[PDB]
Amino acid sequence: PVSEKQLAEVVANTVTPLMKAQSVPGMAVAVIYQGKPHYYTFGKADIAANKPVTPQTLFELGSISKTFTGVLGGDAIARGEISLDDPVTRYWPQLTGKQWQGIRMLDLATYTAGGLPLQVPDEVTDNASLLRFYQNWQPQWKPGTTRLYANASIGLFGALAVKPSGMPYEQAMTTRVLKPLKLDHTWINVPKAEEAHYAWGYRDGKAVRAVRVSPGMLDAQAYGVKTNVQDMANWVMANMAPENVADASLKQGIALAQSRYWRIGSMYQGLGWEMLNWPVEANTVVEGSDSKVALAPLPVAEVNPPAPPVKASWVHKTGSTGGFGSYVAFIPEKQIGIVMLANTSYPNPARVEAAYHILEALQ
Numbered sequence: 001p002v003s004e005k006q007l008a009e010v011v012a013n014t015v016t017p018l019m020k021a022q023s024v025p026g027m028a029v030a031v032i033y034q035g036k037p038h039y040y041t042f043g044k045a046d047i048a049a050n051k052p053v054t055p056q057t058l059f060e061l062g063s064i065s066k067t068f069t070g071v072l073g074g075d076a077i078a079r080g081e082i083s084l085d086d087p088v089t090r091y092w093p094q095l096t097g098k099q100w101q102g103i104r105m106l107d108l109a110t111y112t113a114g115g116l117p118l119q120v121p122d123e124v125t126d127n128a129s130l131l132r133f134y135q136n137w138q139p140q141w142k143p144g145t146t147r148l149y150a151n152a153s154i155g156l157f158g159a160l161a162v163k164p165s166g167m168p169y170e171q172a173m174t175t176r177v178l179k180p181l182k183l184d185h186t187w188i189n190v191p192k193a194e195e196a197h198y199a200w201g202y203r204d205g206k207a208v209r210a211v212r213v214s215p216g217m218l219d220a221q222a223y224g225v226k227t228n229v230q231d232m233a234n235w236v237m238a239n240m241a242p243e244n245v246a247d248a249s250l251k252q253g254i255a256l257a258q259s260r261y262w263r264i265g266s267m268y269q270g271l272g273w274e275m276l277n278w279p280v281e282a283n284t285v286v287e288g289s290d291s292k293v294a295l296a297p298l299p300v301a302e303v304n305p306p307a308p309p310v311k312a313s314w315v316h317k318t319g320s321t322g323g324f325g326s327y328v329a330f331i332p333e334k335q336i337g338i339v340m341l342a343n344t345s346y347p348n349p350a351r352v353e354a355a356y357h358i359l360e361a362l363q
């Protein structure tokens, strides 16, 4: 029964040393505790302009954008528009290469298609060349046997998952996920009227921001999600407690995103989200966040059928861009969670260590 006064100290005593040690210009933190969000802001959103971080400052989520993709995909499944058991070719009949037989939407969504690479090559500058890329790809492993984190994998899942709806990814996300949850300050493309809240990212001392990719069915997702700490806190709350979400299919989509589809060592792969059974030790989580392991191709143990959301889980996702570093984690059983948005990409292990320390105090 930690008081708000104590929580404020715990956060300050953890984030302050962190920002100084990692040279973080600014950070927006939100802790979900006792049914509501608690906000703490530190530093600058724009160093040269001397603008401070506020609850309205927009940060780049990077790969945490994948959690929105997973939920949007879950929603489409709950609507009957797609099934994770359908072959990828059902949604893209032009993908005729036989190496695709046996590869399911589930494999694309969870990085198990057989070695799709981390990124889609820069040579891919339109849809005709994207098809060429997937047609030419030769898997290094059979489907459902190896997990290799890849934007070329989940990115395609996202583009194909919204096809039945008839809407482009950005529009489908806004209409079916953001608007319903009242995340009205979360964007792919920041409107010029909101640009004043857009923080600058920093890399080796230079102010930087994300750039757009070549027009295609993956361009919106590639551009990624931008949002403030309030919307992000509410995103965590909706995923933490889908029972409070009214829309029937979105509620189910949220559940599908936290379901366990594969076990890799001590972690479980969901749709976007990743999970570990709770209780879990800090070194298990921190050590798993190292790029050496996070990007390696590892063997998977199938969870068939998928295990529905386990309340006693540590649910999280890290994400970065050239100038931003973010992390989100929550434990449904305890109804506690945390969001940490920063405008500099610092080591993922430091993010995990800090988040764990703060939540450990609330447990």
Ligand SMILES: *C(=O)c1cc2ccccn2c1N/C(C(=O)O)=C(/C=C/C(N)=O)C[SH](=O)=O
Pocket (backbone or CB within 6 Å): 061, 062, 063, 064, 118, 119, 151, 289, 290, 291, 292, 294, 295, 318, 319, 320, 321, 345, 348
């Ligand atoms: C997501 O944030 C993302 C997408 C890609 C594709 C290619 C290169 C970079 N990654 C990122 N971000 C990073 C990063 O630049 O630090 C990641 C690093 C890996 C790690 N665990 O250290 C992957 S992110 O955490 O999902």
Ligand code: NA
Pocket (backbone or CB within 6 Å): 121, 123
């Ligand atoms: Na290439």
